[PDB]
From Swiss-Prot, chain B:
GO biological processes: adaptive immune response; antibacterial humoral response; B cell receptor signaling pathway; complement activation, classical pathway
Biological role: Constant region of immunoglobulin heavy chains. Immunoglobulins, also known as antibodies, are membrane-bound or secreted glycoproteins produced by B lymphocytes. In the recognition phase of humoral immunity, the membrane-bound immunoglobulins serve as receptors which, upon binding of a specific antigen, trigger the clonal expansion and differentiation of B lymphocytes into immunoglobulins-secreting plasma cells. Secreted immunoglobulins mediate the effector phase of humoral immunity, which results in the elimination of bound antigens.
Name this polypeptide is given: Immunoglobulin heavy constant gamma 2
UniProt PTM comment: Glycosylation on Asn-61 is required for interaction with Fc receptors and ability to activate the complement pathway.
Intrachain disulfide bonds: 25-85, 131-189
Organism the protein comes from: Homo sapiens (Human)
Assembly description: Immunoglobulins are composed of two identical heavy chains and two identical light chains; disulfide-linked.
Region described as CH2: 1-104
UniProt keyword Protein transport, yes or no: no
Lineage: Eukaryota, Metazoa, Chordata, Craniata, Vertebrata
Record key words, sorted: Adaptive immunity, Cell membrane, Disulfide bond, Glycoprotein, Immunity, Immunoglobulin, Immunoglobulin domain, Membrane, Secreted, Transmembrane, Transmembrane helix
Length: 207, 208
């Protein structure tokens, strides 16, 4: 019958005041015969009631997927509270329960380095601006590129990857018209992470 | 009833002739009643009898997992032959057929650039030498580091990531004693990819 997956909030959403983090409870394999799904949510054992239920999503294997979204308080999540989704459905012998909470372990501060494009790339029309973020723990992090206080269009950040020492690193690749780089514009890598002062730092790069 | 997952060879294995590439057919959710599985393998529709099967192994959810491994010839994979695994089990209405082949699509040549450590990282006892490989397709690739013609093995390489324009990129980070960098040693990044001339390119870096 149905199965349940419980997902943590987006890293950026738990670190920034402008964002509202969410805990997401997904029920798959809901059969067309028993479509009513019931959610009960608990923060550290105490039932809460601010959850919302998305439009049901039909799937191509002839099943529904039903999703309940629970907004959480930033500091609750960062302090280690446990979030419990309990799912009831007539297609289940017993209700299913899943619990999620912040990843544990000694936090460690990202080191952020910006690297200009290789000289050998200078023959091309577009060049690559590189942000190396290493040494951090846990792996939840967010990395962006901006110029003149506005976010950039053409950049990609690799998923974090485990390093030798049990910390994580990643790279972010910003693709930029060589003209923009040559005029002298300043470009900025912004890193958001729970172990930074104010959850935020920024490093800049120009010619 | 059983499900089947069919896995391609490891990228490095398809490119180096010192390595033996393999396709792996994994069957999970095999019940205690009906525990016997038969595998049939086809290369371009033609049945081969080459596969080697791993004894069934019980999981902690009471089901079995059974694995068939087929050795593949580097050139057949590179040329796009289709490998078909057919799984027969009594707990199944009809056998399950799964097929895999090299990723189709216009190959594109990797651009390889090496990047020295940040100015600001030189304050540390170990520095990162970066190797950026971008613009390549398909995703199968291999990356290594050498100095003075011997392997440097203190590196991590990210999985390929998909870019906007359909090409892939990755980064490889080699960590060295700052002393070794400052002493002017030459380090090199070796990339192996089907769209490079002779499937190989190499790019070096040294302190200016
Ligand atoms: C019918 O179809 C539905 C829908 O699937 C869709 O339709 C079909 C027809 C196909 O086309 C599908 O390809 C298509 O996607 C099927 O539903 C799928 O069911 C599987 C399980 O059967 C679920 O797998 C789990 O996936 C999570 C990751 O889920 C994220 O990433 C998916 C892409 O990889 C994405 O599809 C999901 O939507 C989800 O995306 C996230 O969504 C949240 C909330 O919206 C969002 O905040 C995130 O940003 C977003 N992220 C991304 C990247 O998009 C994965 O975590 C699970 O892995 C566990 O279980 C595996 C075994 O199943 C095991 O291999 C893993 O290692 C891992 O194991 C766990 O390990 C932990 C610790 O390591 C351990 O504590 C646990 O014990 C262990 N748990 C185990 C073993 O269960 C898992 O892979 C799909 O998410 C789900 N798809 C969707 C869209 O919901 C359905 O199964 C089909 N029915 C039948 C009968 O076939
Ligand atoms: C009973 O238990 C077994 C054993 O599980 C183990 O024990 C239990 C108790 C749990 O604790 C588990 O956590 C624990 O692992 C269960 O068997 C599992 O079954 C699931 C399916 O439910 C399989 O999931 C698939 O996994 C592959 C990835 O598989 C690799 O990675 C796993 C770790 O992530 C690893 O465990 C696997 O062994 C396997 O490892 C690879 O092995 C090969 C061969 O040797 C090797 O060459 C590789 O190097 C190696 N790789 C790694 C990383 O180590 C994943 O790709 C599948 O994803 C597809 O399906 C999902 C839906 O299930 C969907 O969400 C995904 O998006 C993706 O969907 C596909 O999407 C593409 C397009 O993107 C589309 O073209 C496809 O059509 C579409 N396919 C589908 C089906 O939608 C999938 O997640 C586990 O691999 C398997 N584990 C093992 C060890 O065999 C069993 O499920 C349990 N049964 C019950 C009832 O509980």
């Amino acid at each position: 019958g149905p199965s349940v997956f419980l997902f943590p909030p987006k890293p950026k959403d738990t670190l920034m005041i402008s964002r509202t983090p969410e805990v997401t409870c997904v029920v798959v394999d809901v059969s067309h015969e028993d479509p009513e799904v019931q959610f009960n949510w608990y923060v550290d054992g105490v039932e809460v009631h601010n959850a919302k239920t998305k439009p049901r999503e039909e799937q191509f294997n002839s099943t529904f997927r039903v999703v309940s979204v629970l907004t959480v308080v930033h500091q609750d999540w960062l302090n280690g509270k446990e979030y419990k989704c309990k799912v009831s459905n007539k297609g289940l012998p017993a209700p299913i329960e899943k619990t999620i909470s912040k990843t544990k372990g000694q936090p460690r501060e990202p080191q952020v380095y910006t690297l200009p494009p290789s000289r050998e790339e200078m023959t091309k029309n577009q060049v690559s601006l590189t942000c190396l973020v290493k040494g951090f723990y846990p792996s939840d992090i967010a990395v962006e590129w901006e110029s003149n206080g506005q976010p950039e269009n053409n950049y990609d950040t690799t998923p974090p990857m485990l390093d030798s020492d049990g910390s994580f690193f990643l790279y972010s690749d910003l693709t930029v018209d060589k003209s923009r780089w040559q005029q002298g514009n300043v470009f900025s890598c912004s890193v958001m992470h729970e172990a930074l002062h104010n959850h935020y730092t920024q490093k800049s790069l120009s010619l």
